[PDB]
Amino acid sequence: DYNLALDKAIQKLHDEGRYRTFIDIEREKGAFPKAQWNRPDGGKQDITVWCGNDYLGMGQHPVVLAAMHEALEAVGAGSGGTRNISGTTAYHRRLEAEIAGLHQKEAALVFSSAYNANDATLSTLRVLFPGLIIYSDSLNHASMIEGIKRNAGPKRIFRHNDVAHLRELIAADDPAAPKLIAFESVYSMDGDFGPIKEICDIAEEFGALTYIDEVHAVGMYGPRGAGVAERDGLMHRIDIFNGTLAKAYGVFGGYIAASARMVDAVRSYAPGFIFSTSLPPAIAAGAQASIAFLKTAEGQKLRDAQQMHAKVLKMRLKALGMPIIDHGSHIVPVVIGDPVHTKAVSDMLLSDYGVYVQPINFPTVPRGTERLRFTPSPVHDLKQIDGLVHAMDLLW
Template identity: 55%
Template sequence: MDQSLLRHATRHCPFLKRTPVRSLRQLSTTSVVGTARSPSAATATSGSALVAMARRCPIMHDAVNARAASASQCTRMHSTRSEAAPQAEATPAATAPVTADTPSSNNTFDYEGLYGDELNKKHQDKSYRYFNNINRLAQQFPRAHTANVEDKVTVWCSNDYLGMSKHPIVVDAMKQTLDRYGAGAGGTRNIAGNAALHLALEQELAKLHRKPAALLFSSCYVANDATLSTLASKLPGCIIYSDALNHASMIQGIRHSNARKRIFRHNDVAHLEEMLAQEPKSTPKIIAFESVYSMSGSIGPIHEICQLAKKYGAITFLDEVHAVGMYGPRGAGVAEHLEFDANAATSRPVLGSAVDEVDIVTGTLGKAFGVVGGYVAGSAALVDMLRSYAPGFIFTTSLPPSVVSGALASVRHVSTSNVERLGQQRNTRTLKARLAQLDIPVVPNPSHIVPVLVGDAALSKAASDLLLTRHGIYVQSINYPTVARGEERLRITPTPGHTDAMTDHLVGALESVWRDLELMRVSDWVRAGGRAGVGLGARHVVCALYTPCPAFCAMPIVL
């Protein structure tokens, strides 16, 4: 049986679905020549008991016979002994060749059936995504209402980390711009959609990251995809070295580039160097990684990776999506945060700093800045090349003026105010300490992310549902493929808007859910050998990355 027919059969035949591959191979190599009606059919079926079984199947019967007849016809056309293969032996099915995706030329492909099969897979492995109806209330955030406007809940998993989406400076700027310029941009950046606001925001973002230029995209997913795919496709023989936990947008960009890729273990610079050393220094290389990994809260080793890039002739691509607005004296991200005092003293690049060493930075306007959109910052030539070649930039409608205006107002405010950052960090630290006291497992990390480990997809969903329906708290469960199987979790993100009373309520609710569902605590994970950094030994102190405030330095977090 040829490969196309086998692929179709495996998708649709219950027997093939549940039969081990080893058994199928054995059947496919078992001779059944004697079962054929003619020499040509014998040739088509010789060595395959699997085909003989298919002939007895009411679904596959027609397809197998049609394929055999088609092969018979082809043999007659190329044979010099045409008299040995009488025309009468051709079956009517020979006039209806079978395509790779259909069992018979008379049947159309079952599209809806495929959709259902794919969804069933998601339900069976508990990775199906449920979308809660949550409507954030601008004047009351982090409060929101569900589908019932009278049903109020507290949101504890928003990426609006600083609550900037409701900040008066941002909202007023958007209202005024909406009245003046209308709802849409009117076209792509190259055709009628390139306004003074877009240029001003790009200049502000370049200034924030201390780079010569920046370029706006509709989202950072698009920015990552477009930048990596365009850049790597232009570099001859390029190799991309990607952290194992990189975001899907970066993975997609790498795929679209058609460049060679090498995946190094998460934050493992020794493994990265081992791979870099295998290639000539002259080979173009891109090292793609993140500053804050959003599902674990871990921090990328920026300096160490930049040093390796310099040593082996690579350039660095740093995704600061979950760090912009959150770290550094001006909110430029972890790269700026690493030399906090030096960067606070000047707006120019500090020689030898992480900001200076990183070649390309991407970020979002949709998380800490509270609006929507993405961007890339780097050299003027790089940005101009992306503007000229990247399909994800060229062939999409420009961001609406009101959105750009709101983002511009937010970036300018966050770059001059530490109030929101300090409030968020203080609430994060308090929550981590409270959960540690209750032995509730938080994946250890130095960032603003609070990943509470559950370790089971169904239980993670059940915990999320209980928090929402019984306690009026919305925390989304995170399952595969966003995190590895067995590392399912609740991802909590405090904001400066969460009050002490809200924190008390959340901690009490989590304790109740852990008790009712009998979920594993840190001590249980220790006995089980640990998972995702939880329970891998004695309790240890994890120092928060954000330590410019003396009050923070005096509050180590025990996890």
């Protein structure tokens, strides 16, 4: 009985308090962070989005949108093919060039998403480097874990940010074996930073490749938004960059950036790259325009505003005695530690106060660390922050 099995699988989620109820919204372009909440009763309510990943409000930026509207009128809705069969366009090459330039790399490769970029690249690296041992941070994103486990091969999990542990593991292994160390610059849920310099030092000592996921940093850190490696001057020490175009860049898609050899090899061997339709030209146009804008001094102004708003939100919430985990990033987690109560707090914030902060539970965060994750942006002014705080105070 297939239906019984499905019923059991679903019940297990309810029993663990982690069954997820999605909130149907429509963000109001030109008025971010405002959205219309399409309620389950059929009603419509204005809300403030407080948990999204469009960190800099680039989703409503006129230069991004102008580029997208233009592309649609020039070449139409989609590419109509894979990169190999009619789906390689000028918009794809120009995008890849912008990305490569962002990370000061020879080349770059766009995928349908950063999830796909990670999963396809990490798994294909095992094929390209027979015997590859992948060393992975215990809190690495699912896309990386999935790519690492995908093709059979050695993996070693190191304790989160624990470079002494990483060293212990790498030193125990066959020195002749090829090696790659996979980690993040900014971890999505805690909002803490990866120890990029120390990992690069280990990698040089043990002759390993470095693979960094900067998905939660691109657009937001460094003087041109190239990420935390750019902020800290370590870009040249990273072999492969993984990033997304769907978060601070405000559009959709993902990428790797690396040497021309690395990129040419991955694109020639990765099934996830080869056997899927290329990104729509309009998406590629918008993303490129977003990347280019964020490399400028005008882009720096949005980063400065984000950091200032994040700082202020954190002050205000600490002032209440909220349990906020503050690692110094733009991410503002409030840990509840129970999946059911996290949903209850989130539900009451939404329905009674028009504050939308999705409850975050397993498998996105470890069991018992369920939380609300605030993502203050340049469009969340000091008055919105005030309004949120007040709602949180009233709610306790």
